[PDB]
C-alpha cells in the first residue's frame, strides 16, 4: 500500500477481455478492452499507465504476464519493478473479485448507452473513480501521491 | 485552474496524434488515431475525464467544438466544452512548442518501437517525468491535491 504499487487484473465480458490496473492503496483504476490478453497488449497497457502515474511496482495478474519477455521489456523501459501477484494476504484475492463484480455491475447499468463495449468500460471507470464511499478513489490517489512527493 | 485542459491535434507518419494538455502543469495524455473524428475525440475525452477531474476542455478546432458526439461525451462526463481561441496569444506559442518537443522525443525513441503508438506513449512518459524543480506529473498531482483540500 505504498504510493507506487499497482495490481493488474484481467476479467472477461461479451467474448472480450477487460484489462484493469488497480492502485492498491486508493482503489483507483484504469482499464481497457482488448480482444485477448497477450504479453504485447499487457506491455502496451503498462507503458500507458506508467506515463500517467508514478508506477513503482506492478503485481502481475498471472504467471504468463509475469513470464512474458515483452511485459518484462516494458517494465524495464518504464522503470517498473515487475512482481508476482500471489495473494500472500488472502484479503487481496477477495478484494479483486469484488471489484470485478462491481465493475461488471456498473457496465450493466450503462451498457445500453453505448454501442461498443469499450465505451461502456470507460463509463464504468469514470463512475468507479468518482464514487464517494468521504473521498472518491480519484481523490485518494492524488492525496496519496502528493503527500509522497512532499 | 486545476480542472482546465486543452486539446491539441498534430500529424506524424500519415497518422494523427490527439493530445490533451493540463494547462496549469503541462502534463499530457495522448493517443494515436487514423484520423480526427468527433467519435474518436469523444471517446478520448471520456477516457481522460474518468482518470482526472476534468472541469473544462478547450477544444482544438471548430469541428470538434461543433460535433454533437463530442458535446454528448462532454455532457456525459460533466465537462464544460469551450472553444480554444487564443485570447492570450501565448497559448498559440505554447502548443506549437509542445508539438515540436513531442515530435523531437518521438524521433529520439522512434527506432525502439515498431508501431507509432508505442513511440507516442514513450514520449508521453518522458514528457511527463522531465524535471524542469518538479516534473509535469508532479505539478499536476500537487495542483489537484491542493484543490481537493
Amino acid at each position: 500500500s505504498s504510493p507506487g504499487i499497482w495490481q493488474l487484473d484481467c476479467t472477461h465480458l461479451e467474448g472480450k477481455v477487460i484489462l484493469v490496473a488497480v492502485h492498491v492503496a486508493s482503489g483507483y483504476i484504469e482499464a481497457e478492452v482488448i480482444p485477448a490478453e497477450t504479453g504485447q497488449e499487457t506491455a502496451y497497457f503498462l507503458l500507458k499507465l506508467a506515463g500517467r502515474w508514478p508506477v513503482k511496482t506492478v503485481h502481475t495478474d498471472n504467471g504468463s504476464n509475469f513470464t512474458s519477455t515483452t511485459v518484462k521489456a516494458a517494465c524495464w523501459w518504464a522503470g517498473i519493478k515487475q512482481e508476482d501477484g500471489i495473494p500472500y494476504n488472502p484479503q487481496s484475492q477477495g478484494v479483486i473479485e469484488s471489484m470485478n463484480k462491481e465493475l461488471k455491475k456498473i457496465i450493466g447499468q450503462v451498457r445500453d448507452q453505448a454501442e461498443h463495449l469499450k465505451t461502456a468500460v470507460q463509463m464504468a471507470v469514470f463512475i468507479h473513480n468518482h464514487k464517494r464511499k468521504g473521498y472518491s478513489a480519484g481523490e485518494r490517489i492524488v492525496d496519496i501521491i502528493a503527500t509522497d512527493i512532499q | 485552474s486545476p480542472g482546465i485542459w486543452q486539446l491539441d491535434c498534430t500529424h506524424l507518419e500519415g497518422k494523427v496524434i490527439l493530445v490533451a494538455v493540463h494547462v496549469a502543469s503541462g502534463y499530457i495524455e495522448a493517443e494515436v488515431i487514423p484520423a480526427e473524428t468527433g467519435q474518436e475525440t469523444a471517446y478520448f475525452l471520456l477516457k481522460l475525464a474518468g482518470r482526472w477531474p476534468v472541469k473544462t476542455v478547450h477544444t482544438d478546432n471548430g469541428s470538434n467544438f461543433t460535433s454533437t458526439t463530442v458535446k454528448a461525451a462532454c455532457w456525459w462526463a460533466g465537462i464544460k466544452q469551450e472553444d480554444g481561441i487564443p485570447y492570450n496569444p501565448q497559448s498559440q506559442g505554447v502548443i506549437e512548442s509542445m508539438n515540436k518537443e513531442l515530435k523531437k522525443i518521438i524521433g529520439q525513441v522512434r527506432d525502439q518501437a515498431e508501431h507509432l503508438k508505442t513511440a507516442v506513449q514513450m514520449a508521453v512518459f518522458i514528457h511527463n517525468h522531465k524535471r524542469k524543480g518538479y516534473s509535469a506529473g508532479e505539478r499536476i498531482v500537487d495542483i489537484i491535491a491542493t484543490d481537493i483540500q
Binding site: 504485447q40 506491455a43 502496451y44 519477455t69 515483452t70 521489456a73 516494458a74 523501459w77 | 525502439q112 518501437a113 515498431e114 508501431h115 508505442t118 514513450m122
Partner: peptide, 8 residues
C-alpha cells in the same frame, strides 16, 4: 524484430 513492442 528487435523492438520493445515486437521483440522478434
Amino acid at each position: 524484430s528487435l523492438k520493445i513492442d515486437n521483440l522478434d
